[PDB]
Design a protein that fits this description.
The chain is α+β, with helices and mostly antiparallel strands. It has one domain. It is 21% helix and 33% strand. It is built from three helices and seven strands. The protein has a four-stranded antiparallel β-sheet. It has a three-stranded antiparallel β-sheet with strand order 1-4-5, covered by helices on one side. It is found in: Secreted; Nucleus; Nucleus, Nucleolus; Cytoplasm, Stress granule. It is an enzyme of class 3 (hydrolase). Its main location: secreted.
């Protein structure tokens, strides 16, 4: 039942952004249904779905600490940090774009969970 891989996709994947700023985060967080109530922190990965799917293999992946997997290649990622202590909307965010490895959990060769803690 790959409905957790799709869920991952929805939360932590945006192929080809363009904008990667406040305006971006503030919009995408709402569109992906994470802005009611507002998620304190969330990161999106950009580029190939292939590259991310390949973290579960040894093609682009290693085993990480406690039954996780870390990418070999670094990814173009954008971290949306919620501004203010407001649990409910408006959700205003500060974007943090970067290039770095990603750590996920794979089930049936598909990533389902993204270790958010590594960002902040």
């Amino acid at each position: 039942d790959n409905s957790r891989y799709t869920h991952f996709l929805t939360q932590h994947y945006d192929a080809k952004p363009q904008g990667r700023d406040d305006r971006y985060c503030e919009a995408i967080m709402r569109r992906r249904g994470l802005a009611a109530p507002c998620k304190d922190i969330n990161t999106f990965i950009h580029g190939n779905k292939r590259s991310i799917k390949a973290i579960c293999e040894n093609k682009n992946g290693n085993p990480h600490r406690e039954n996780l997997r870390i990418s070999k290649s670094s990814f173009q990622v954008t971290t949306c940090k919620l501004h203010g202590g407001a649990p409910w909307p408006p959700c205003q965010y500060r974007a943090t774009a970067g290039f770095r490895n990603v750590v996920v959990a794979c089930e049936n060769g598909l990533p389902v969970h993204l270790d958010q803690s590594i960002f902040r």
